[PDB]
Tab-separated table of C-alpha atoms and ligand atoms in Angstrom:
chain	number	residue	atom	x	y	z
P	1	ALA	CA	88.680	0.973	51.444
P	2	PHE	CA	91.932	0.939	53.440
P	3	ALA	CA	93.284	-2.322	54.861
P	4	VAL	CA	96.850	-3.210	55.806
P	5	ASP	CA	98.351	-5.664	53.308
P	6	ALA	CA	100.507	-7.853	55.545
P	7	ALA	CA	101.166	-10.474	52.852
P	8	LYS	CA	102.590	-7.825	50.532
P	9	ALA	CA	104.608	-6.169	53.310
P	10	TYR	CA	106.348	-9.412	54.255
P	11	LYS	CA	107.242	-10.241	50.638
P	12	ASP	CA	108.791	-6.784	50.178
P	13	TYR	CA	110.647	-7.011	53.489
P	14	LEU	CA	112.031	-10.367	52.317
P	15	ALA	CA	112.944	-9.097	48.837
P	16	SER	CA	114.964	-6.247	50.373
P	17	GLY	CA	117.030	-8.702	52.441
P	18	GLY	CA	115.044	-9.010	55.670
P	19	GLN	CA	115.558	-11.868	58.110
P	20	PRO	CA	112.671	-14.366	57.820
P	21	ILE	CA	110.331	-14.789	60.776
P	22	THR	CA	111.892	-17.190	63.285
P	23	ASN	CA	110.723	-19.497	66.086
P	24	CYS	CA	108.374	-21.504	63.926
P	25	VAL	CA	107.793	-24.644	65.995
P	26	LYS	CA	109.480	-27.587	64.247
P	27	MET	CA	108.100	-31.013	65.218
P	28	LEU	CA	109.852	-34.315	65.720
P	29	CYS	CA	108.459	-36.981	63.396
P	30	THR	CA	109.488	-40.067	61.430
P	31	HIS	CA	109.777	-38.241	58.089
P	32	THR	CA	107.998	-41.196	56.441
P	33	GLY	CA	104.604	-39.490	56.120
P	34	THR	CA	102.324	-38.695	53.196
P	35	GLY	CA	104.051	-35.392	52.366
P	36	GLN	CA	100.753	-33.508	52.004
P	37	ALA	CA	100.890	-29.778	52.683
P	38	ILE	CA	98.603	-29.235	55.697
P	39	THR	CA	97.556	-32.106	57.927
P	40	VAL	CA	96.028	-32.917	61.304
P	41	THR	CA	99.291	-34.559	62.446
P	42	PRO	CA	102.885	-34.162	61.179
P	43	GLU	CA	103.314	-35.807	57.783
P	44	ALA	CA	106.769	-34.762	56.555
P	45	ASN	CA	108.348	-37.141	54.082
P	46	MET	CA	112.093	-37.474	53.667
P	47	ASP	CA	112.315	-34.081	51.924
P	48	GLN	CA	110.204	-32.000	54.350
P	49	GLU	CA	110.052	-30.652	57.885
P	50	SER	CA	106.772	-30.474	59.799
P	51	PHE	CA	105.851	-27.355	61.781
P	52	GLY	CA	103.031	-26.410	64.110
P	53	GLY	CA	100.612	-24.547	61.848
P	54	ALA	CA	99.861	-21.471	63.955
P	55	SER	CA	103.553	-20.631	64.283
P	56	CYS	CA	103.854	-20.612	60.462
P	57	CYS	CA	100.856	-18.334	59.817
P	58	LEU	CA	101.776	-14.737	59.030
P	59	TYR	CA	98.464	-13.486	60.407
P	60	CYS	CA	98.639	-15.516	63.616
P	61	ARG	CA	102.240	-14.434	64.203
P	62	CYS	CA	101.593	-10.747	63.473
P	63	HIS	CA	98.397	-10.544	65.562
P	64	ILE	CA	96.264	-9.334	62.665
P	65	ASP	CA	93.000	-10.422	61.101
P	66	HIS	CA	92.999	-13.318	58.674
P	67	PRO	CA	92.131	-12.433	55.042
P	68	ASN	CA	89.369	-15.046	55.048
P	69	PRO	CA	86.099	-13.127	55.666
P	70	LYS	CA	85.254	-15.545	58.500
P	71	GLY	CA	88.668	-14.975	60.088
P	72	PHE	CA	89.311	-18.716	59.787
P	73	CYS	CA	92.942	-19.886	59.799
P	74	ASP	CA	93.994	-22.667	57.429
P	75	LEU	CA	97.026	-23.506	59.596
P	76	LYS	CA	96.148	-23.083	63.261
P	77	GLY	CA	95.618	-26.396	65.005
P	78	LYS	CA	97.240	-28.323	62.140
P	79	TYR	CA	100.758	-29.111	60.900
P	80	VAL	CA	102.353	-27.724	57.758
P	81	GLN	CA	104.944	-29.650	55.758
P	82	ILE	CA	107.696	-27.373	54.403
P	83	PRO	CA	110.350	-28.552	51.907
P	84	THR	CA	113.636	-28.883	53.755
P	85	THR	CA	115.294	-26.474	51.323
P	86	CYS	CA	112.718	-23.778	52.226
P	87	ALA	CA	112.531	-24.458	55.970
P	88	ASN	CA	114.576	-21.354	56.802
P	89	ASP	CA	111.373	-19.329	56.164
P	90	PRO	CA	108.167	-21.306	56.744
P	91	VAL	CA	105.991	-18.183	56.971
P	92	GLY	CA	107.255	-17.003	53.591
P	93	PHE	CA	106.733	-20.453	52.112
P	94	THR	CA	103.123	-20.901	53.237
P	95	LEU	CA	102.332	-17.348	52.103
P	96	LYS	CA	103.805	-17.608	48.587
P	97	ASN	CA	102.643	-21.134	47.729
P	98	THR	CA	99.283	-22.802	47.302
P	99	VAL	CA	97.882	-26.250	48.095
P	100	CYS	CA	96.450	-28.443	45.345
P	101	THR	CA	92.771	-28.904	46.123
P	102	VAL	CA	92.768	-32.420	44.588
P	103	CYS	CA	95.735	-34.277	46.103
P	104	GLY	CA	96.608	-31.990	49.037
P	105	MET	CA	100.257	-31.546	47.984
P	106	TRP	CA	101.984	-28.216	47.459
P	107	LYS	CA	101.764	-27.028	43.866
P	108	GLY	CA	105.219	-27.480	42.396
P	109	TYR	CA	106.437	-29.343	45.503
P	110	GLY	CA	104.725	-32.714	45.281
P	111	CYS	CA	101.570	-32.181	43.231
P	112	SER	CA	101.652	-34.113	39.948
P	113	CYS	CA	98.035	-33.660	38.764
P	114	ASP	CA	99.427	-31.908	35.641
P	115	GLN	CA	101.099	-34.894	33.928
O	1	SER	CA	123.339	-47.068	81.529
O	2	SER	CA	120.405	-48.279	79.439
O	3	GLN	CA	118.701	-45.122	80.660
O	4	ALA	CA	120.208	-43.027	77.849
O	5	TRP	CA	117.872	-44.722	75.352
O	6	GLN	CA	114.790	-44.027	77.464
O	7	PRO	CA	112.861	-40.735	77.179
O	8	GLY	CA	113.943	-39.960	80.743
O	9	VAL	CA	114.164	-41.355	84.259
O	10	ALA	CA	111.394	-41.754	86.831
O	11	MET	CA	112.050	-41.553	90.564
O	12	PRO	CA	112.600	-45.160	91.767
O	13	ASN	CA	110.060	-46.426	94.283
O	14	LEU	CA	112.655	-46.948	97.033
O	15	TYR	CA	113.528	-43.254	97.037
O	16	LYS	CA	109.840	-42.421	97.503
O	17	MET	CA	109.865	-44.475	100.739
O	18	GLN	CA	112.718	-42.630	102.459
O	19	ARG	CA	112.387	-39.874	105.076
O	20	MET	CA	115.158	-37.524	103.980
O	21	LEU	CA	115.800	-33.947	105.075
O	22	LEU	CA	115.849	-31.191	102.491
O	23	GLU	CA	119.279	-30.341	101.100
O	24	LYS	CA	120.566	-28.064	98.383
O	25	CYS	CA	120.330	-29.611	94.917
O	26	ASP	CA	123.815	-30.103	93.470
O	27	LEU	CA	123.796	-31.720	90.033
O	28	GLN	CA	127.069	-33.192	88.778
O	29	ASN	CA	125.918	-32.747	85.151
O	30	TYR	CA	124.796	-29.148	85.768
O	31	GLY	CA	125.559	-27.030	82.720
O	32	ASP	CA	125.895	-29.966	80.323
O	33	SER	CA	123.502	-29.896	77.360
O	34	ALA	CA	122.157	-32.656	75.180
O	35	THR	CA	122.653	-32.449	71.427
O	36	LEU	CA	119.236	-31.720	70.006
O	37	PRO	CA	118.408	-32.779	66.419
O	38	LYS	CA	119.021	-30.000	63.929
O	39	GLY	CA	116.587	-27.107	64.359
O	40	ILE	CA	114.634	-28.656	67.288
O	41	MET	CA	113.848	-26.419	70.327
O	42	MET	CA	114.505	-27.576	73.901
O	43	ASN	CA	110.812	-27.322	74.699
O	44	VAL	CA	109.710	-29.459	71.760
O	45	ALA	CA	112.233	-32.105	72.834
O	46	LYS	CA	111.242	-31.875	76.492
O	47	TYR	CA	107.519	-32.289	75.772
O	48	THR	CA	108.212	-35.079	73.291
O	49	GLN	CA	110.053	-37.063	75.997
O	50	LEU	CA	107.336	-36.344	78.563
O	51	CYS	CA	104.750	-37.758	76.136
O	52	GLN	CA	106.950	-40.766	75.305
O	53	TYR	CA	107.067	-41.555	79.023
O	54	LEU	CA	103.329	-40.994	79.472
O	55	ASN	CA	102.864	-43.575	76.692
O	56	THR	CA	104.154	-46.188	79.157
O	57	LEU	CA	101.525	-45.493	81.828
O	58	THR	CA	97.882	-46.520	82.124
O	59	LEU	CA	96.377	-43.232	80.951
O	60	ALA	CA	92.642	-43.156	80.337
O	61	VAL	CA	92.026	-42.103	76.732
O	62	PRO	CA	88.297	-41.577	76.101
O	63	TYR	CA	86.581	-40.425	72.969
O	64	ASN	CA	86.219	-36.644	73.134
O	65	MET	CA	89.134	-36.406	75.530
O	66	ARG	CA	89.652	-33.066	77.302
O	67	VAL	CA	93.163	-31.772	78.042
O	68	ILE	CA	94.134	-28.431	79.587
O	69	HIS	CA	97.681	-27.074	79.447
O	70	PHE	CA	98.791	-24.308	81.850
O	71	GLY	CA	101.965	-22.307	81.346
O	72	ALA	CA	101.824	-22.862	77.584
O	73	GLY	CA	103.376	-19.611	76.305
O	74	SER	CA	107.063	-19.135	75.538
O	75	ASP	CA	109.066	-15.926	75.568
O	76	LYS	CA	109.068	-16.443	71.779
O	77	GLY	CA	105.305	-15.783	71.637
O	78	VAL	CA	104.451	-19.336	70.481
O	79	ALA	CA	103.419	-22.592	72.226
O	80	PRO	CA	105.877	-25.412	71.432
O	81	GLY	CA	104.584	-27.720	74.170
O	82	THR	CA	101.016	-27.308	72.982
O	83	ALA	CA	102.070	-28.307	69.462
O	84	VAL	CA	103.644	-31.511	70.805
O	85	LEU	CA	100.598	-32.292	72.940
O	86	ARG	CA	98.325	-31.876	69.931
O	87	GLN	CA	100.602	-34.133	67.872
O	88	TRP	CA	100.594	-36.702	70.687
O	89	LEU	CA	96.891	-36.665	71.510
O	90	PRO	CA	94.310	-38.397	69.277
O	91	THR	CA	92.952	-36.195	66.510
O	92	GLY	CA	89.874	-34.365	67.745
O	93	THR	CA	91.043	-34.129	71.378
O	94	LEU	CA	89.798	-30.914	72.948
O	95	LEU	CA	92.941	-29.041	73.965
O	96	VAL	CA	92.831	-25.765	75.930
O	97	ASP	CA	95.959	-23.886	76.913
O	98	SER	CA	96.695	-20.821	78.994
O	99	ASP	CA	99.429	-18.459	80.078
O	100	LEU	CA	100.011	-15.107	81.743
O	101	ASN	CA	101.289	-13.455	78.549
O	102	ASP	CA	99.966	-13.375	74.993
O	103	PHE	CA	101.029	-16.128	72.603
O	104	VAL	CA	99.816	-17.822	69.426
O	105	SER	CA	98.852	-21.439	69.863
O	106	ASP	CA	97.499	-24.500	68.083
O	107	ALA	CA	95.117	-25.230	70.958
O	108	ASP	CA	91.366	-25.215	70.337
O	109	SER	CA	91.013	-22.347	72.831
O	110	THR	CA	93.585	-20.205	74.605
O	111	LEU	CA	93.024	-18.138	77.760
O	112	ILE	CA	95.432	-15.302	78.592
O	113	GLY	CA	95.863	-14.197	82.197
O	114	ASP	CA	96.905	-15.457	85.617
O	115	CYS	CA	95.828	-19.079	85.976
O	116	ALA	CA	93.667	-18.062	88.943
O	117	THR	CA	91.406	-16.218	86.485
O	118	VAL	CA	90.622	-19.465	84.606
O	119	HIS	CA	87.277	-21.190	85.204
O	120	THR	CA	85.800	-24.214	83.491
O	121	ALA	CA	82.332	-25.688	83.760
O	122	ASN	CA	83.515	-29.182	82.920
O	123	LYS	CA	86.031	-31.717	84.201
O	124	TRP	CA	89.214	-32.746	82.443
O	125	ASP	CA	90.939	-36.005	81.581
O	126	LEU	CA	94.540	-34.725	81.580
O	127	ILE	CA	96.057	-31.579	83.112
O	128	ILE	CA	99.551	-30.488	82.007
O	129	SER	CA	101.319	-27.584	83.690
O	130	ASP	CA	104.612	-26.027	82.696
O	131	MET	CA	104.017	-23.034	84.957
O	132	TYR	CA	107.261	-21.711	86.391
O	133	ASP	CA	108.577	-18.424	87.776
O	134	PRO	CA	112.386	-18.110	87.371
O	135	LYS	CA	112.486	-15.735	90.362
O	136	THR	CA	112.182	-18.856	92.563
O	137	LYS	CA	115.775	-19.936	91.757
O	138	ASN	CA	117.061	-17.670	94.573
O	139	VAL	CA	119.737	-19.849	96.226
O	140	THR	CA	120.366	-17.313	99.028
O	141	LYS	CA	117.074	-17.778	100.956
O	142	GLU	CA	115.447	-20.808	102.556
O	143	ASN	CA	113.614	-23.222	100.230
O	144	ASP	CA	110.042	-23.455	101.501
O	145	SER	CA	106.882	-24.861	99.939
O	146	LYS	CA	105.588	-22.321	97.425
O	147	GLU	CA	102.014	-21.106	96.993
O	148	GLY	CA	100.975	-18.923	94.056
O	149	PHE	CA	99.895	-20.942	91.049
O	150	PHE	CA	100.468	-24.184	92.977
O	151	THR	CA	97.534	-23.336	95.228
O	152	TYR	CA	95.383	-22.925	92.131
O	153	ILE	CA	96.649	-26.185	90.603
O	154	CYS	CA	95.821	-28.227	93.719
O	155	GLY	CA	92.312	-26.784	93.850
O	156	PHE	CA	91.845	-27.224	90.118
O	157	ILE	CA	92.829	-30.879	90.404
O	158	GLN	CA	90.472	-31.638	93.282
O	159	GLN	CA	87.501	-29.818	91.715
O	160	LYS	CA	87.987	-30.298	87.959
O	161	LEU	CA	89.986	-33.478	87.303
O	162	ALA	CA	87.832	-36.407	86.247
O	163	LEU	CA	88.133	-39.571	88.275
O	164	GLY	CA	90.548	-41.716	86.327
O	165	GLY	CA	92.302	-38.660	84.877
O	166	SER	CA	96.020	-37.915	85.082
O	167	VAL	CA	98.280	-34.895	85.622
O	168	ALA	CA	101.847	-33.822	84.840
O	169	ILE	CA	103.002	-30.721	86.768
O	170	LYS	CA	106.438	-29.144	86.308
O	171	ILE	CA	108.436	-28.678	89.526
O	172	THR	CA	112.069	-27.755	90.222
O	173	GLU	CA	114.281	-27.644	93.306
O	174	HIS	CA	112.708	-24.335	94.386
O	175	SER	CA	109.387	-24.407	92.433
O	176	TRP	CA	107.381	-26.997	94.361
O	177	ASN	CA	104.484	-27.301	96.768
O	178	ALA	CA	103.914	-29.746	99.624
O	179	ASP	CA	100.150	-30.117	99.098
O	180	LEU	CA	100.742	-31.090	95.470
O	181	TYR	CA	102.975	-33.964	96.621
O	182	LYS	CA	100.308	-34.855	99.178
O	183	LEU	CA	97.749	-34.881	96.352
O	184	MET	CA	99.891	-37.410	94.464
O	185	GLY	CA	98.683	-39.945	97.000
O	186	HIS	CA	95.134	-39.479	95.645
O	187	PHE	CA	96.117	-41.220	92.407
O	188	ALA	CA	96.500	-44.933	91.793
O	189	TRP	CA	100.197	-44.271	91.123
O	190	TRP	CA	102.587	-41.324	90.955
O	191	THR	CA	106.192	-40.443	90.137
O	192	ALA	CA	108.595	-37.578	89.453
O	193	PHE	CA	109.878	-37.871	85.898
O	194	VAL	CA	113.060	-36.231	84.596
O	195	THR	CA	113.453	-35.841	80.835
O	196	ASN	CA	116.783	-37.020	79.450
O	197	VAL	CA	117.214	-33.824	77.400
O	198	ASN	CA	116.937	-31.641	80.504
O	199	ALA	CA	118.566	-33.970	83.056
O	200	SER	CA	121.128	-31.310	83.983
O	201	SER	CA	118.284	-29.351	85.588
O	202	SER	CA	116.474	-29.982	88.859
O	203	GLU	CA	113.242	-29.794	86.853
O	204	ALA	CA	110.915	-32.792	87.011
O	205	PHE	CA	107.307	-33.471	86.089
O	206	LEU	CA	105.197	-34.637	89.018
O	207	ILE	CA	102.918	-37.220	87.404
O	208	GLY	CA	99.737	-38.475	89.038
O	209	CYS	CA	98.314	-41.475	87.202
O	210	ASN	CA	94.547	-42.250	87.376
O	211	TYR	CA	92.853	-39.939	89.891
O	212	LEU	CA	90.805	-41.578	92.668
O	213	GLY	CA	89.423	-38.480	94.388
O	214	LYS	CA	90.485	-39.561	97.882
O	215	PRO	CA	93.752	-40.530	99.593
O	216	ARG	CA	95.018	-43.954	98.677
O	217	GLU	CA	98.154	-43.140	100.668
O	218	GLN	CA	99.231	-40.445	103.112
O	219	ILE	CA	102.185	-38.438	101.786
O	220	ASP	CA	104.088	-35.742	103.678
O	221	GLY	CA	105.003	-33.334	100.893
O	222	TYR	CA	107.904	-31.618	102.664
O	223	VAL	CA	109.527	-35.016	103.172
O	224	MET	CA	108.742	-36.209	99.664
O	225	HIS	CA	110.402	-33.192	98.041
O	226	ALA	CA	113.441	-33.849	100.232
O	227	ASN	CA	113.315	-37.430	98.950
O	228	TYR	CA	113.142	-36.159	95.365
O	229	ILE	CA	116.164	-33.890	95.844
O	230	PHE	CA	118.048	-36.720	97.551
O	231	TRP	CA	117.390	-38.945	94.522
O	232	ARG	CA	118.545	-36.202	92.142
O	233	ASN	CA	121.624	-35.444	94.286
O	234	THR	CA	122.829	-39.070	94.288
O	235	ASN	CA	121.835	-40.260	90.778
O	236	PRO	CA	123.444	-38.304	87.944
O	237	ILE	CA	121.376	-38.676	84.794
O	238	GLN	CA	123.308	-38.713	81.529
O	239	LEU	CA	121.994	-36.059	79.153
O	240	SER	CA	120.480	-37.753	76.153
O	241	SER	CA	118.432	-36.951	73.061
O	242	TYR	CA	118.424	-40.552	71.768
O	243	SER	CA	114.679	-41.163	72.164
O	244	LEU	CA	113.878	-38.139	69.976
O	245	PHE	CA	115.010	-40.000	66.852
O	246	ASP	CA	112.378	-42.763	67.114
O	247	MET	CA	108.856	-41.425	66.738
O	248	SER	CA	107.138	-44.434	65.157
O	249	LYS	CA	105.250	-45.323	68.352
O	250	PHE	CA	104.726	-41.731	69.521
O	251	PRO	CA	100.943	-41.185	69.102
O	252	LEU	CA	98.870	-41.705	72.215
O	253	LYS	CA	96.855	-44.883	71.709
O	254	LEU	CA	93.128	-44.154	71.411
O	255	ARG	CA	91.804	-46.650	73.958
O	256	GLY	CA	88.174	-45.471	73.765
O	257	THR	CA	88.092	-45.589	77.565
O	258	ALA	CA	84.577	-45.615	78.978
O	259	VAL	CA	83.138	-42.396	80.425
O	260	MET	CA	80.341	-42.629	82.991
O	261	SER	CA	78.560	-40.153	85.188
O	262	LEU	CA	78.345	-41.417	88.756
O	263	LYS	CA	77.501	-40.016	92.168
O	264	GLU	CA	79.890	-40.248	95.107
O	265	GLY	CA	77.675	-42.870	96.740
O	266	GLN	CA	78.230	-45.252	93.816
O	267	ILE	CA	82.051	-45.349	93.773
O	268	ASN	CA	82.512	-48.910	95.036
O	269	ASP	CA	85.693	-50.989	94.965
O	270	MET	CA	84.876	-52.471	91.561
O	271	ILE	CA	84.748	-48.915	90.185
O	272	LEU	CA	87.869	-47.843	92.087
O	273	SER	CA	89.588	-50.891	90.600
O	274	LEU	CA	88.677	-49.895	87.039
O	275	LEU	CA	89.810	-46.324	87.749
O	276	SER	CA	93.170	-47.596	89.015
O	277	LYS	CA	93.732	-49.597	85.809
O	278	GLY	CA	93.072	-46.793	83.339
O	279	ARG	CA	89.818	-48.395	82.183
O	280	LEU	CA	87.277	-45.801	83.305
O	281	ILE	CA	86.702	-42.038	83.432
O	282	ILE	CA	84.005	-40.557	85.671
O	283	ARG	CA	82.642	-37.136	84.700
O	284	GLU	CA	79.774	-35.564	82.822
O	285	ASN	CA	80.098	-35.570	79.042
O	286	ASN	CA	78.454	-32.189	78.410
O	287	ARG	CA	79.959	-29.434	76.289
O	288	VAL	CA	83.250	-27.826	77.274
O	289	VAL	CA	82.905	-24.187	78.377
O	290	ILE	CA	85.736	-22.084	79.802
O	291	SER	CA	86.241	-18.462	80.727
O	292	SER	CA	88.764	-16.082	82.247
O	293	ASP	CA	87.818	-13.408	84.752
O	294	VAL	CA	88.604	-9.848	83.678
O	295	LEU	CA	89.134	-7.098	86.238
O	296	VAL	CA	87.492	-3.849	85.114
O	297	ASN	CA	89.169	-0.495	85.838
O	298	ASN	CA	88.660	3.095	84.672
O	299	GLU	CA	91.912	5.023	85.265
O	300	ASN	CA	90.676	8.419	83.962
L	1	LIG	C1	121.397	-22.875	90.844
L	1	LIG	N1	121.941	-24.235	90.798
L	1	LIG	C2	123.330	-24.378	90.948
L	1	LIG	O1	124.047	-23.390	91.054
L	1	LIG	C3	123.747	-25.751	90.920
L	1	LIG	C4	122.864	-26.785	90.734
L	1	LIG	N2	123.486	-27.992	90.739
L	1	LIG	C5	124.752	-27.694	90.935
L	1	LIG	N3	124.998	-26.351	91.058
L	1	LIG	C6	126.311	-25.703	91.257
L	1	LIG	C7	126.719	-24.835	90.077
L	1	LIG	N4	128.073	-25.148	89.630
L	1	LIG	C8	128.275	-26.081	88.676
L	1	LIG	O2	127.872	-27.224	88.804
L	1	LIG	C9	129.025	-25.684	87.415
L	1	LIG	N5	129.452	-26.887	86.679
L	1	LIG	C10	128.131	-24.837	86.494
L	1	LIG	C11	128.529	-23.398	86.449
L	1	LIG	C12	129.604	-22.860	85.798
L	1	LIG	N6	129.657	-21.508	85.993
L	1	LIG	C13	128.599	-21.134	86.787
L	1	LIG	C14	128.225	-19.881	87.261
L	1	LIG	C15	127.093	-19.792	88.057
L	1	LIG	C16	126.355	-20.926	88.370
L	1	LIG	C17	126.733	-22.173	87.895
L	1	LIG	C18	127.869	-22.291	87.093
L	1	LIG	C19	129.152	-24.443	90.317
L	1	LIG	C20	129.101	-24.613	91.831
L	1	LIG	O3	129.279	-25.995	92.156
L	1	LIG	C21	127.817	-24.105	92.485
L	1	LIG	C22	126.589	-25.032	92.625
L	1	LIG	C23	125.421	-24.252	93.215
L	1	LIG	O4	126.852	-26.123	93.529
L	1	LIG	N7	121.519	-26.565	90.579
L	1	LIG	C24	120.585	-27.672	90.358
L	1	LIG	C25	121.023	-25.267	90.616
L	1	LIG	O5	119.832	-25.041	90.497
L	2	LIG	C1	108.636	-22.380	81.199
L	2	LIG	S1	107.491	-21.278	80.382
L	2	LIG	C2	106.785	-22.556	79.240
L	2	LIG	C3	107.091	-22.214	77.787
L	2	LIG	C4	107.651	-23.288	76.841
L	2	LIG	N1	108.279	-22.679	75.620
L	2	LIG	C5	106.503	-24.249	76.517
L	2	LIG	O1	106.353	-24.658	75.344
L	2	LIG	O2	105.751	-24.505	77.489
L	2	LIG	C6	106.534	-21.129	81.980
L	2	LIG	C7	105.346	-20.179	81.917
L	2	LIG	O3	104.606	-20.149	83.154
L	2	LIG	C8	103.804	-18.987	83.070
L	2	LIG	N2	103.288	-18.667	84.397
L	2	LIG	C9	104.001	-18.467	85.548
L	2	LIG	N3	103.267	-18.149	86.591
L	2	LIG	C10	101.973	-18.141	86.083
L	2	LIG	C11	100.722	-17.863	86.678
L	2	LIG	N4	100.562	-17.487	87.953
L	2	LIG	N5	99.626	-17.938	85.889
L	2	LIG	C12	99.780	-18.261	84.601
L	2	LIG	N6	100.906	-18.538	83.934
L	2	LIG	C13	101.972	-18.459	84.736
L	2	LIG	C14	104.719	-17.905	82.492
L	2	LIG	O4	104.061	-16.891	81.741
L	2	LIG	C15	105.714	-18.718	81.634
L	2	LIG	O5	105.583	-18.486	80.238
L	3	LIG	NA1	113.698	-22.999	90.369
L	4	LIG	NA1	94.036	-39.252	81.114
L	5	LIG	ZN1	96.645	-18.067	61.256
L	6	LIG	ZN1	97.572	-32.019	42.810
């Protein structure tokens, strides 16, 4: 019945003025990539930064189990594209947002399947 | 001059041929820093330049390539170098990393513990080591060849590096080992490579290119480290981050290098020639299995 809710704890810590998790590993890249959210190699476009996935995963960084029943990590071993305006808090961004299952872009940050 | 637009500087061949005595390393540019792009960590930049330089060598790049990375953890609890290696290496490359202390990593498997506890069934195509103990930078005592993890690395190379494979091993003025330099002569080619972002440091990567499994050349490692320090002492390297802004040719080219299993009796000069040119890897192609020894203790 009981299970720590790390996702909720980080959001509340942020809302009350906490410093976002640091030392997410930012990659060098051309910034001419597809702009998709989560990729096997950095794909930032001109408006994004690419980060090593594991360093942007709340569960990886906090040393706690992943919410997936299999304990699989969506980010580890991959690269996550974060909008430049949100790159001060990549863990918060990946936590709060969701990836369009059709085009692979972030909902509301690239995905246009709704027009 | 033109060196500031390169990823770094490799030790020129003439310095390798000297017979210098070991001196203190005194870097004119000591304490300078390069200007890193906004938000980029020193270790991302350093690994990026190491990979850009490795792109200019004749690395074997087979399908199902196997790379192991020692000293992969940072005091930040993450693995910046591993992230760059994974970016650099072809998608699907098996990447294992390791460190003494816990860290979160993008590698396919991570082993935590002293490197001497690491065992692998299989052989590897590329070994990268950033292992370093800052307690070696003691300028008050004599600077002798060091053992510790360097003893492990030499043994690991001789037992677990595929023929045709390559290595890049971090050394410094005081963190070095004579047998490792000697082992450089068991590759078709070798160098000590200084990254332009960290050129104010005596750090270098000792790079052995295409392993042959026997001495092609006899190298005295105490002399060669003296030669390396001589080179560093007399050739200031201008700090530079210029190469970090051009990543269009960064990915390691997937050459599909051939992998064959062969027995020591069959390594003829034709084979040795293909090894030397980056055109062949010799090892089994079984599954990759690793483990770390755990010491068991009951303190009650
Ligand atoms: C440990 N070590 C060196 O220690 C070293 C060095 N290469 C050169 N030095 C210099 C250092 N140094 C400078 O170069 C100054 N610009 C920088 C500096 C300003 N404040 C300091 C306070 C403490 C230490 C340094 C400084 C001053 C002096 O010359 C001493 C010395 C040993 O030779 N290398 C490769 C090396 O590994
Ligand atoms: C310079 S740090 C590398 C971290 C850097 N941020 C990166 O991305 O690689 C060097 C590492 O060597 C490791 N190390 C030193 N001696 C070791 C040993 N005997 N066995 C295993 N790791 C060792 C330390 O834990 C240390 O983190
Ligand atoms: Na040192
Ligand atoms: Na190789
Ligand atoms: Zn994770
Ligand atoms: Zn979409």
